[PDB]
Amino acid sequence: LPMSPNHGTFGGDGMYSESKLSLETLFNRWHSESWANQLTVCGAIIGW
């Protein structure tokens, strides 16, 4: 997952920040749902 460190820090990016923040639910959903055998999650907080 391409993730960001900046959640609404710069601003004027539409819904970029609530798109990139919402991917971070997949880190809990892997333990809680039933797809943990088909998919693994590797967040990459991509820098400047």
């Binding site: 993730m3 900046n6 997949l26």
Partner: protein, 97 residues
């Protein structure tokens, strides 16, 4: 699940918005100043020299014209073209065949 930070420590800079805005403004002021000082030394120079000591700087450019060659084959000197063929060839072939 694996969370990797490839952020390069940029998280430890406080007020990154303010900090990057300041860096842009410290480049822009420095560029704008020097542009205004360059524009005023170009105008001073214009006034003092008019366009008489400024006409000596301008040089004539040569724009190419198409010169369409027929691309005939480049014939070498006989020494260079005696190398590629074996020596025995000379006078062996019937050049009407």
């Amino acid at each position: 699940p694996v969370m990797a930070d490839l952020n390069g420590g940029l998280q430890f800079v406080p007020e990154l918005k303010e900090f990057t805005a300041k860096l842009r403004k410290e480049l822009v002021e420095t560029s704008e100043v020097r542009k205004a000082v360059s524009i005023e030394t170009a105008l001073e120079h214009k006034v003092v020299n008019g366009n008489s000591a400024d006409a000596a700087y301008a040089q004539v450019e040569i724009q190419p014209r198409a010169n369409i060659q027929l691309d005939f084959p480049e014939l070498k000197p006989y020494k260079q073209v005696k190398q590629i063929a074996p020596a025995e060839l000379e006078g062996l072939l019937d050049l009407e065949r």
